[PDB]
């Protein structure tokens, strides 16, 4: 991003800590839900309790 | 005579029965001093009767 | 009326004291007797719904 | 007319005479005369009735200051004519590039008033900021181009004694707003160009109008908030006893106070039937 300081502009770079921080225009919610179902299938919880 | 005005209002404007009056119905006694001050509006009685109704309502409650 | 109302034509209702004059008006056109309470936008939209 | 009890009549007539002293006397602010907030009877009289006495005191003071409502008409005309003079001067003045000065002068040019009290407070500031931009550009002192920052409203190239007396007068205007007294024409006209002259006069009248308006509005706000507080305390204290009289007083109080007309309606509703709702209010 770009940030404001006293009468000045500054640039800011910071890390996206977790997968979810990726924008929902590039990593949309349905993709995340299907990935969760993939995890469920991995854990033999395909029908969850 | 304030008594004449009070009897006139009670009997004509408000049309109360003789068995209940400002002597035996104190909130009416307090409201009659206000009502006598309103010389006009004696032609329409329903407004005054409804006003006394809601005064009795606000006089008695537990909330 | 024939002309939009204004703060003078609107008059608040007293709801509990002997507001005789508005009773004497009752079926009156000119004065708009209204509660002093107001509807916020959200509850206004709920009414409209 | 106000009527309240608990006090000896001498203090009541002192309070009313004080309300008659209001328009002329300095420091027009209710908390700026603590002795009147002493004479309410607090820690002397009965709580339930003394808080009512204080409510009526605050309501009367609010009603008087609202009745005076500073009538800034001719100074508004002065502001508009100074604005037009600055506009003409800027259009004649040889600026560095026509676009920037033309735009600020245009937003200055069409700034005239609108027959509403509340909006003038915004538009006077909105005109002054652009005027100061223009004046700064005229004499090549800088202006802040940072996004989200507006160049502060101030004079340009006055000598410090003039602006010091301006600020002392502004403090005096803070103390009293109805006794408007602008006379600060110490401008020796060879002090910088005609544009500086006109913009200094414009910023002076704009700061005057803005200060008067804002002080009156904040006085309104404080009075309204505290009177609504007092109304809530009366309804709370009166709830403890259920009876026709206390219920009538409560139903009087359950009116809100968010407008000046609301306060007028409230005061007249209390006064009109003071023999209906007084039994529960004891003297001492």
Touching D (3+ Cβ pairs <8 A), the chains are: A, B, C
Way the structure was solved: cryo-EM
Rounded Cα distance between D284 and D279, Å, is: 13
* Structural Rg of chain C based on CA atoms: 14
Distance from CA of C47 to the nearest CA of B (A): 29
- CB contact under 8 Å between C14 and D269, yes or no, is yes
Q: At what angle do helices D260-272 and D194-238 cross, to 10 degrees?
A: 40
* Residue that is written with structure tokens 């989200």 in the block: D148
Rounded Cα distance between C13 and B35, Å, is: 19
Chain D interface includes C17 (CB < 8 A) = yes
- CB contact under 8 Å between D247 and B34, yes or no, is no
- CB contact under 8 Å between D147 and A8, yes or no, is no
Distance of CA C2 to the CA centre of its chain: 18
Cβ pairs A/D, distance under 8 A:
8
Kindly state the DSSP code that residue A7 receives in the 8-state scheme.
Answer: T
Q: At what angle do helices D244-253 and D260-272 cross, to 10 degrees?
A: 160
Chain C interface includes B51 (CB < 8 A) = yes
Resolution (A): 4.3
Chain B interface includes C49 (CB < 8 A) = no
Which of D144, D145, D146, D147 is best to mutate for the A interface (most A CBs within 10 A)? Answer: D146
D46 burial (CB, 10 Å; 0-12 / 13-18 / 19+) is: middle
User: Is there an interface between D and B (3+ Cβ pairs < 8 A)?
Assistant: yes
- Identify whether the C-beta of residue D236 lies closer than 8 Å to the C-beta of residue B46: no
- Residues in A closer than 8 angstroms to D148, CB to CB, are 4
Rounded Cα distance between D24 and D27, Å, is: 10
Rounded Cα distance between A2 and A11, Å, is: 4
Distance from CA of A4 to the nearest CA of D (A): 9
Chain D interface includes A2 (CB < 8 A) = no
Neighbours of C48 (CB within 10 A): 6
* Structural Rg of chain B based on CA atoms: 12
- Identify whether the C-beta of residue D180 lies closer than 8 Å to the C-beta of residue D75: yes
Rounded Cα distance between D55 and D47, Å, is: 12
Neighbours of D280 (CB within 10 A): 18
Strands A2-5, C32-34: pairing is: unpaired
Neighbours of D105 (CB within 10 A): 22
- Residues in C closer than 8 angstroms to B54, CB to CB, are 16, 18
Task: Please provide residue C10's backbone torsions phi and psi, each rounded to the nearest 5 degrees.
Answer: -80, 135
* Nearest Cα residue to C20 out of D100, D183, B45, B21: B45
Rounded Cα distance between B18 and B25, Å, is: 12
Q: Which two tokens stand for residue D96?
A: 């560095």
Rounded Cα distance between A43 and A35, Å, is: 13
Q: Which residues of B34-50 are buried (b: 16+ CB within 10 A; e: fewer)?
A: bbeeeeebeeeeebbee
Q: Which two tokens stand for residue C43?
A: 């509850």
């Amino acid at each position: 991003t770009h940030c404001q300081e006293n009468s000045e502009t500054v640039a800011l770079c910071t890390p996206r800590i977790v997968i979810g921080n990726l924008p929902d225009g590039l990593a949309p919610g349905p993709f995340h839900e299907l990935r969760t179902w993939e995890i469920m299938e991995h854990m033999r919880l395909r029908p969850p309790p | 005579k304030r008594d004449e005005k009070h009897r006139h209002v009670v009997n004509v404007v408000l049309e109360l029965p003789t068995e209940i009056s400002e002597a035996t119905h104190p909130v009416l006694a307090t409201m009659l001093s206000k009502y006598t001050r309103m010389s006009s509006l004696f032609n329409d009685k329903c407004a005054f009767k409804l006003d006394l109704l809601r005064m009795v309502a606000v006089s008695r409650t537990r909330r | 009326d024939r002309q939009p109302l204004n703060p003078a034509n609107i008059e608040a209702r007293h709801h509990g004291v002997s507001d005789v004059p508005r009773l004497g008006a009752m079926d009156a056109d000119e004065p708009l007797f209204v509660d002093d309470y107001r509807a916020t936008d959200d509850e206004w939209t709920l009414q409209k719904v | 007319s106000l009527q309240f009890i608990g006090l000896q009549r001498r203090d009541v007539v002192a309070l009313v005479n004080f309300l008659r002293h209001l328009t002329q006397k300095p420091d027009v602010d209710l908390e700026a005369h603590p002795k009147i907030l002493k004479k309410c009877g607090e820690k002397r009289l009965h709580r339930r009735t003394v808080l009512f006495n204080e409510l009526m005191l605050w309501l009367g003071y609010y009603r008087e200051l609202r009745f005076h409502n500073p009538d800034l008409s001719s100074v508004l005309e002065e502001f508009e004519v100074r604005c037009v003079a600055v506009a003409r001067r800027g259009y004649t003045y040889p600026f560095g590039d026509r676009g920037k000065a033309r735009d600020h002068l245009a937003v200055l040019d069409r700034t005239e008033f609108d027959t509403d009290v509340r909006h003038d407070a915004e538009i006077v500031e909105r005109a002054l900021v652009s005027a100061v931009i223009l004046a700064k550009m005229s004499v090549r002192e800088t202006l802040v181009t940072a996004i989200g920052q507006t160049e502060p409203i101030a004079f340009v190239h006055l000598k410090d004694t003039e602006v010091q007396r301006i600020e002392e007068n502004l403090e005096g205007v803070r103390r009293n707003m109805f006794c408007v007294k602008p006379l600060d024409l110490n401008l020796d006209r060879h002090a910088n160009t005609a544009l500086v002259n006109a913009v200094n006069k414009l910023v002076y009248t704009g700061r005057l109008i803005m200060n008067v308006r804002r002080s009156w509005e904040e006085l309104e706000r404080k009075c309204l908030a505290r009177i609504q507080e007092r109304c809530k305390l009366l309804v709370k204290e009166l709830r403890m006893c259920l009876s026709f009289d206390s219920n009538y007083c409560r139903n009087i109080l359950k009116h809100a106070v968010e407008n000046g007309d609301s306060a007028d309606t409230l005061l007249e509703l209390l006064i009109e039937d003071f023999d209906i709702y007084v039994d529960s209010f004891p003297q001492s």
